[model samples]
Target chain A: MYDVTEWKHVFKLDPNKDLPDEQLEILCESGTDAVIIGGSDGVTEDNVLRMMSKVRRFLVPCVLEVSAIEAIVPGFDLYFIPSVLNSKNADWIVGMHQKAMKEYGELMSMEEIVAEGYCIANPDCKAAALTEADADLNMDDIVAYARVSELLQLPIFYLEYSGVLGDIEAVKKTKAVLETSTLFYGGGIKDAETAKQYAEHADVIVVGNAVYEDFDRALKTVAAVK
Target chain B: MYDVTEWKHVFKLDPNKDLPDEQLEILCESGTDAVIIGGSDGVTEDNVLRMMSKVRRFLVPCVLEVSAIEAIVPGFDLYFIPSVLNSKNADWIVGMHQKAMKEYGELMSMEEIVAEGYCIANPDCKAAALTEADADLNMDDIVAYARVSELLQLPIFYLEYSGVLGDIEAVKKTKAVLETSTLFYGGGIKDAETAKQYAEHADVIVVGNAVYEDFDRALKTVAAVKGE
Candidate 1:
């Protein structure tokens, strides 16, 4: 199992569409510490396995970020199940986890990560809507959530700015207060400069759509964090 | 109270941001039967109430489509809570309803709408992601959903094509089976012609982003349905 503390960068691959074998090989070579295979929607077991099988050809530790209950495919290096802390919907927080454990308890060892998402700017994103994210949170409210993540003894605290690039000041402030939990920042990290800036504060920087949009640019993001 | 059986069109308003008072008035005047106040994300009771109050200034039935449990405002003409039939997540199907009833049962009367969503093209939308919508489904599966909606005696059967305009063949096929349920269709309606095309099949054509994009064009859409 790869230690959570050791993870510096993660590449979240959405299994909505097929990524060519050539592109998959390039992303594996790109300095991404781990690859998370799953998306918020359109996740089926067949597609997850197909994507996982392709990524497994490379040397990086492949992880499954289970968005749907059926997305829990075996044979991954680790399982990163997200418990959405700010989700008003119980399914995101505990419902999915309960169902997952009921089915996949004997299949694999799972690592549950607490994701306290503050959907400040991006209202249209699936993550923001699914979680019923607090749109009007100030910096102080975010810091309080950060402290709660530490107190709860969660290993990884993810700040998912999924729809839009988040406030750098908010990220910086939250990073300042976190003591032990590994801070993971994701969303809108399209270029090397933005990736580098987020990497300075966050323990791991996650880039998703950038890879699908521009293969060469994603490499720069992977290289930036490394 | 407007009857679901007789209603022809609904104007779904997203209260995520401020819509001008003049635009709100114009929309109400544009022959929409009712205004549905809610978006897939960022819906709060404060915003719902604020938007409802604005839309109510004109003469129309203002309905609250509750996105979150907390978004159940007490004084709307009626509340339309959607139970997503195709959602893999139970929270969207029954959990939200249980929570809403527990908290807001005494506050208002709610009419449950069965939304059998088939997210064929757009998976990135808030509704698709939240519901864990089935992205791959054949025509047979969609037909089965239509039968189920009718069997359950659901008042409204909504086919949400929020991310993209749905396939016309699929809409026509589903409408063919639904006898009792009111067929509601929304998404990718940019102009009057598209609206008229879908309106021919669907009982109630709901439009939202179209109005926000161009108020004048939306009026054309409203007029097209009214045969003006």
Candidate 2:
């Protein structure tokens, strides 16, 4: 029902974390292009369906950023599949992808699936630890990885900062080299100004933790970029 | 005890397949730097051990190219661990390597274990199908992959042809770009002339199928490269 390329701002919600009805309403209707539902842990099918249904109340396109296969529910406009490129172990890169593709591939809508290459930016975040990502990379390494992502021809090159804000210059430099892939920046985008700053460098700004942490500041992000 | 950087020619042997007693002797005794043991299928612990024991008769360094973890046996001089870089699936790239690293990493000697990035060149070979490599790659894609292997800082960038001969021009270009990684060319080195041609461009020449199909022709590969 929606196109992802036009998406400039996205509000990412966690299945594991609770969002009050008022906050959920504010987020979905915040004029952000879409509402993405996912989290790293405690994500089950029941938790996901509940979160999806809550966001379903609004007109915003909902995305299931498929982190856990068991937590997957139908009816989402897009399925953002993140393959962690910086993970030392290939498990997150294509190991789980191979498993997910083989299992649900036959029944799932292939068009709904979007492959995202996640370059983990924050070493302290659980995303890096869980994936065993060598996240503390220099600018050259980051740009080189950005090139690899485009060479691999992934649709999205997401600089996932997980919980903290990342380097704007690195995001800018990463954007400079990327030709075919859309540059997506997430993590540490707490306020309108921060969102606007990264939005200038990144093609899409993913406002996540702020949805639960700071309701007003996060909502302002929608207008800041648009 | 031997250094791999100095190796100009290596003969790959299948642990699953048989080598006539005389041929195995001649191949090992020949001036080839090493004999690598392992195969895609029918490889077991017993078969590897028997093959290793046979190759041990000669002074050349015997390598266990760890294709199957179950077939792993100790006492080999070195372990050439090939991670298929061109495999469509991650299983060959780092899936199995992760498994191998986690289980045997502590017990195994890190120095003896050499990580080699394999870019499968021959699409028709069983290795390409087994690893599910997009072997029929364009020149640009091939050079890009060669750069990726080097960027990954892999010790050896093996252009694995599996059973058939591969592109010599591609090998020459691949060698031209590589700064540190050793470029290894294997497949279709059927005779001395073929071996000498690839040996000039590639850092090390790998002779495999020809050894099994034509014994004498394969044996000359060692002398031709060594200029002996």
Candidate 3:
């Protein structure tokens, strides 16, 4: 698990198709602490386990991209809770965990929470809309959720951009609200300039899917963000 | 984990609260395969780990109450997936699990699932209002969710209840649904006869919180559900 202090850099690997064992061994040697095993399209337990088996071959800590507790438990390390449900389908946060625990002894870790930073940002996506549990991302609701995070005492809080990327206002506004939260900013972050914009404010700047579109250019972005 | 095929009976233990280790040991020794470790109030990871450690002291294969990868990767053997979202709170499902996993990892096991058989007797609680994206519980949705289980090749499906006390239709409906999936029922079950009614139709019956509220009655309900 990446501690709040050690979140220097994280690599989002596309385990959907495959991450060859040899290439991964090289990456693990590169000082990547963890690699998330999941994607935008819903993946299954078997595939997750397959990804872990490969990553495990390299001796890297595997945080499974989990939809529920039953997916990659014994196979990987901890689960990667995505921001998918924050917009739509608010069920993954607790419902999946609740049901799984009743039948299986799976409850034993603090989940990563997305501190939905203040934004009435443009280009709303399905996830943000669905996760709001049918509520608007108005200022009042965002602040209410922020306060609740304090009560939950979560380990990490990621500030995300759901749609229409490149909204630094969202990050600035969120940073203004949080006292001691680990912030993250992602979504359509393409160039070094954009990455640096987030790096100046965010503890972690997630640039994936788009990064793969141009690794060298994105590396420049990563360097800039760093 | 209690194979939905063999999930005859069991009780719920809120991980945040105290539970008699002897009783839990007895349950496991007597044929129970798992124990759930979550509740509406106070069931944290530390509480769960302490409970599992207690169960481990007695050599019980603790099934930690969890919803995502964190529960499984940590020192737990199995996990449960409750479709019952806590009220209108959208954060109850995967978000909560993500919040937990960002901190740690342990070993976790997997179990086949069936939707918990509830609404068998005309659910009397707030769950009736619970639906996917606030939609109604149409047969299409249930069947689709069930098919997703089939696609995942899940071995069991549980029917559930939030409140169907003294109601038989809930169990009956659950049994009817069992033809397409394995049935496990929980929530608001109060007596041996009620448990038996569910067992008659479904393969497993979960009775707890209420059982802890009344132990002998819970034991009797367990036996009755098993047709003893």
Candidate 4:
């Protein structure tokens, strides 16, 4: 089983596009604790299989962040099924899971993460837009999300500020409140300083756009957290 | 009834948050052709009623871009339901429509816009992310989308670049191929210059974040297109 305790950071690679061999080498070397293969769009069976095939060459535990039902292909180290807690649409919460259950048949193999997203400032991002995220949340609202995550016995609690870097106070507060749930923070980690700051509060600092922008800088960000 | 043909620009105001009365007046004065009240998050019945009630005080036709089925409130002059053409998730394309049919009954009153989104560069945006949009598409693929819009007899075709400004070539090519569909373009319209450039090609230029960023600059953008 892929352990959340072991993973300090994740390099979220979109399966839709091919990662350069050189950059893939850098990631394999010391970029992240784990490789998360998935994205919001263009996730097909072929795309998933092709991405996994390339990613499997790396020795690190490759985790599949399943966005689509068709993307639930075999041969991943672990699976992450996310439930957006602040989603206005029920489809993002339990409706998607219900659909997946009927189509995929008993998804006991996957690990679930209840993510409390604060997307008020930036509602344009796909996750925030699709989920219809409740961005109008206070510090108390976020703490309550952590409490819900703990009550559900969900292994992971993610603060998925997918486009913009979220409230630092909210991250710190949520981290302080969650008892056992592994906190994963994503969005706006452009440099080593930002990474270190988030790393201080979050258990795992997930990086995406930064890696695509500058591989060297992102590698340093990954190392800074460690 | 709210007509897309008459709408030159749409001021998309999120009902989740409250805008100052002065800003609302600015939008009412020189912002755009119409006011669209709705967003992707925290859109409850009360939120809708409250927002629309405030917006109704203005003279412009207030339209609701329904994100949730429950948000189909009575006050708005018209409703805009979007169907994303390049969505990986079927929910965005048809499933939501299916639900709306059962729940809202005949949506003949609502203006339906079939949006062809190429969200590859900025998947972080909700439309790109949830639709699982095929962002890696080329000019040929985009033209194909225009062709699909034409075939479907969909009245409105929107090029929804929610986060990033889309390629000029793709926008030009799509507009060239589309015969009947009213081409509506959105995303990354930060300045009046960008707005005018898109206005040259697209029939209707839909702007959002620009207004929220600076109402003055957004007004300048509206004036640039209208030559006011």
Candidate 5:
């Protein structure tokens, strides 16, 4: 079985963004362990399906990190169902997941699904605002979330610094606490330089904006993570 | 070529400390890539050459990390010339190194003479006290030493913690910044677990007192780092 826990590097592509066919092909086959087809805004069934179709040509494992329940499309290798830990809204925490389970409970393969214990670290980013997360978390609070993620038996504890480079020190301490759950770090990974810096701590590093901004540097992140 | 860069695990034996000839044989032939014969205090010409001659019986590459000027010995594969980075006195920085070179510079094979840009990380250790090192270093200061060690084109950046386990975060950041210089972490690595933790960041994990304290645990430190 393909394992999400074994993934060292992932490239997340926004469904709302228009990536040239060549760039999409380059990313899909970039040896980056996995390609996450997702976005916060303007993500719908059509956009998700379109990305799935474009990314399917290559052998890289494709993941659907669903932002909207209605936008959940089929044919993805894995489904990253996130339960926001720092979100103020109960809907994003349990209510939304409960709603999705009711709609697509029976047909889904349980093995292909993994839940991310998500922490919104960067408040300036769109994810923090959209999820209604209280992003004023201190270092001790961050470690608490990390310890809880492992204690709760979550498969992944995601430290999403969606805009700037989040705290590397925080990432290191979080990794020290986590024994089972794969520690995921994203944001501020602009080039190979940042990717390698964060890669030292996090089990898996997600490179997002770099793919669209600088394709060459994005391509280099694969080896940097390893 | 015998490359210290290729060495992932090293066992540092004190010249002043005694090891059973049987235990000495075990450490020397253990899967650790090399054995470093070094000590801080009471290191003399007799102690150094005695440790070297005993360690030479086994095939493991033996190193003489000379602490005393009078203790310069022959027959070792490598010599670690430490130019202490955090020293308050100038002798440990340059004067001590220059004195050794003046004595052994002509006879010594230049290739075997590898200089270590040493940074004393732990203030509690004897090396920090003897070298008169300014060990009140912050995170940025440690990173500065790490950067400077690489920039100076030094082959090794030795972060000696002599007593307790030094800051792991500092080691991680230091490893991230280093481009070519091999980062070595010694001290506080008492067993397999502590060795593996430091091995995550440092290019080489040097196990010292553990060898004399717990001989079995010291053996496991080698494979734990080799990732076997």
Candidate 6:
């Protein structure tokens, strides 16, 4: 889903084992540009493959939600380097790549990043919350993240608020400072209308859980907004 | 959770972002034992504090997962060194500790580990499926991992699935070779019955994801197993 051409739009799905094959068929039929796969939450090859099988018939290119050489299939478009999806595991960002390259020959492709999308405002969730990142940061910190976005030379910066509902103030604050060059925002965007609002500044609008619940409306939402 | 006694039994919870408070509270109420907090999904300081707070009211002895030293709080009972989690970033497993000492001062706990857990079957899921380690290994690999475990002197060998699951044969084979060392088995184990089964061979059984859904059931799973 990191295709620059498809940047303005794409479909994101929770590719866990739980996703039924029927749901995946709908994702493809709904004109999803591509599939974003991978999750820090117990992502396994089987889960990935199961999700892939369901969506493969749709014939859209797939992008891993997280990067790992072992996880990459030869045909997928590219991968996302999630700096911290509400957490800090630098290894997941930079280190897993090293292992991937070291173990398997390099599988090159365009790269994208979702800086600090892992950080969650919710303090109640533990396992998903344990992150290597500084969960709390001011605009300066987020701006620093934006700077890293430039440093990493990422094509897209998926600014996301994980686990809780949308945060307009936080999004407005972050959007105000980040350089306009990179695409911004994703995650926890509950509806098409909310996503459309963010899309004013956000180059991409990813609908995952929401889409899963309402595919037809999600498609109409994608079409309704711009 | 790394307490010597806990080495025999510990409750496991899925490293989740949506775990409810009531479920965690019940885990706290049940004599449910200590918690080892870390998410293979995505590591975050929130997970740390969330972990601490869940059991904080109960005064449960919690072990702060040592993924990043930046969040380490001395209030924690023990600290772990998950060497394999950051295999690519060698800095995390050890280098981070050295930097932490210079920056955060000495730790306050008596238990510290430079633990190494390796994966064994199903290279795809890595350890979560075939082995409890985030990474996998074979019998010979176990020998190598044991060597690393010895080097790190990590008293606990937490074998967790994180929902990836594991290879019974590979794990059983690994157990045979590991002998009486501090062995742990986790991932995909959902109930007390399964926990009880593994307890015979393992020193610890971590119950992730399930605890968030059913704390009482998880507690019973923890209590279901018997040992010294």
* Worst 10-residue lDDT window, candidate 1 chain B: B112-121
lDDT of 3: 0.49
Q: Looking at model 5 chain A, which ten-residue stretch has the lowest summed lDDT? A: A102-111
Chain B TM-scores of the candidates? 0.91, 0.94, 0.66, 0.87, 0.95, 0.74
Q: Which ten residues in a row have the lowest lDDT in candidate 3 chain B?
A: B101-110
Q: TM-score, each model?
A: 0.49, 0.56, 0.46, 0.48, 0.50, 0.44
- List DockQ for all candidates: 0.01, 0.05, 0.07, 0.01, 0.01, 0.02
Docking class of 5: incorrect
Selected candidate, larger TM-score, 2 vs 5: 2
User: Regarding DockQ, does 3 or 5 come out ahead?
Assistant: 3
**lDDT winner, 2 or 6:** 2
Q: For residues B1-228, could you state the per-residue lDDT of candidate 3 as single tens digits?
A: 335455566666666566576666655554443555653333456666676676665444455545443333245555554433333344443344324322321121124222231222223443344332332344433433343232222345544454444334544543553444565566677777777766675566777666456656665775675543
| RMSD after Cα superposition, model 5 | 18.5
lDDT of 6 by residue, B1-228 (tens): 335534556665544456677776776565555666663435566666767766666666666666566555455565555545324343433344434433443242234433434332334553333213335454444444443332223455555446655665545654654533567777666777777777666666677766666656666776677423
Q: List the lowest-lDDT window of 10 residues for candidate 6 chain B.
A: B125-134
User: Could you give candidate 2's per-residue lDDT for residues A1-226 as a string of tens digits?
Assistant: 4766677999888888887768788777778998998687436898888887787767888889988667668867778777777777655765455445435643343436676878887889778888888789877667766765654446788998878888889999999878777898998888999989999999999999887887888899999999
Q: For candidate 3, what is the DockQ-based docking class? A: incorrect
The regions of model 5 sitting more than 4 angstroms off are: A1-226, B39-41, B109-111
lDDT of 1 by residue, A8-100 (tens): 888888887666658888788777899988586447888898887888778898888777777777667777766565555646644464455
Report the CA-based lDDT of candidate 6 relative to the real structure: 0.52
* iRMS per model in Å: 14.4, 11.7, 12.2, 16.3, 26.3, 12.3
| Candidate 6 chain A: worst-modelled 10 consecutive residues by lDDT | A109-118
Off by over 4 Å in 4: A106-122, B1-228
The model with the greater lDDT, 4 or 6, is: 4
Candidates' C-alpha lDDT: 0.69, 0.78, 0.49, 0.68, 0.77, 0.52
The runs of at least 3 residues in candidate 3 whose Cα sits more than 4 Å from the true structure, single-residue gaps closed, are A17-27, A31-33, A57-61, A68-70, A82-90, A106-144, A162-164, A220-222, B1-85, B88-228
Cand. 1: chain B TM-score: 0.91
Better of 3 and 4 by TM-score: 4
Clashing pairs in 1: none
